[PDB]
Amino acid sequence: TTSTGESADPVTATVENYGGETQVQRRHHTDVSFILDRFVKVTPKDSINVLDLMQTPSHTLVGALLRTATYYFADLEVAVKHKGDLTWVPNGAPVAALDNTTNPTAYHKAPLTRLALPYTAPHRVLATVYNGRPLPTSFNYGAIKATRVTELLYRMKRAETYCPRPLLAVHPSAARHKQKIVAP
């Protein structure tokens, strides 16, 4: 199958050329909303933690797949293990607000506490990369405060991605990347 490469129009040749037969595909596991819905760990800070999806490590499955889209939208679910009373604050609210029990506050109930949070940012859709290294302060879901927070998790809901970006793998030194695979 020959064509003009400079066209950039996608050209997918198939096995039927030399006499194969194309099989059936089931792509559920690569679906954006499916693959990004799960918890990923973020190293917390003792008291105040601004909820931000860019704090996830870049090499994690949720971190990497997030960063491959310039423009992303989703709700948020958090799972927190903390002491005291976990207080949440909406986007753009003053830091002095986190001390008010009137704001949403989850009294400590062991082992941990799970919340579901709406998309609170003013911008129609958020961004992983911004041209203006820093990202604007308006990108965040708000912050949470507690006497101390031991663990923090993010789970995206209804994820939507736009304008894909490079996704890199580990570069082997030898001809292949050889890892020890689970075996009995």
Partner: protein, 46 residues
């Protein structure tokens, strides 16, 4: 749509569990990948 296993209706209104979308006035890439040219550009022999 995402990963959800409940065969029964969510206990809380759709208005609470999620943020409500609004309107105004795989979309692009699937419509792009569906136009891929699978053919042969030249005459076929045998």
């Amino acid at each position: 749509s995402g990963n959800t296993g409940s065969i029964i209706n969510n206990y809380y209104m759709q208005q609470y569990q999620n943020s409500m979308d609004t309107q105004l006035g795989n979309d692009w890439f699937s419509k792009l990948a569906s136009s891929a040219f699978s053919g042969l550009f030249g005459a076929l022999l045998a």
